[PDB]
Amino acid sequence: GSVVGGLGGYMLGSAMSRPMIHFGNDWEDRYYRENMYRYPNQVYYRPVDQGSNQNNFVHDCVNITIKQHTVTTTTKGENFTETDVKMMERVVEQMCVTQYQKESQAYYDGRRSS
């Protein structure tokens, strides 16, 4: 978990498993389903601290992860459609939420809520 390529130092999450996300269109639910195992299983984040926040950790994590699985992959041998990346904007969000609910509670060690 350090500078995974030309990352700004960012760490790389432990391998998660493929979420369930239904989006609010039946085709989206089904489409996501028919490729659920094709989506990424890890996400990239920076160390939360007292000047970070979830809306900068998760937000940048969605960008960074896409920038290492879309910007690092469409340029290679992918042609991810914006539809696919619209799906990844949910998976990576809830994944990096899950990674934050660990890392943040490691950062705080006290300031987490008392």
Residue 44 phi, psi dihedral angles, 5° rounding: -120, 140
Experimental technique of record: NMR
CA distance 36 to 17: 10
Domain-by-domain residue ranges, the chain? 1-114
Integer angstrom CA distances of residue 108 from 4, 75, 102, 113:
25, 38, 10, 9
The DSSP secondary-structure symbol of 109 reads T
Cα angle for residues 59, 63, 65 (degrees, 5° grid): 110
Identity of the amino acid at 35: N
Contacts of 34 (CB under 8 A, 6+ apart): none
Task: Note whether 7 and 44 are within 8 A (CB).
Answer: yes
Cα(62)–Cα(45) distance, integer angstroms = 9
Place of tokens 């489409």: 31
Q: How far apart are CA 39 and CA 19, in angstroms?
A: 9
Task: Give the span between the Cα atoms of 25 and 11, in whole angstroms.
Answer: 33
Spatial contact of 98 and 16, defined as CB atoms under 8 Å apart: yes
Task: Give domain 1-114's CATH number out of 1.10.300.10, 1.10.790.10, 2.130.10.10, 3.40.50.2000.
Answer: 1.10.790.10
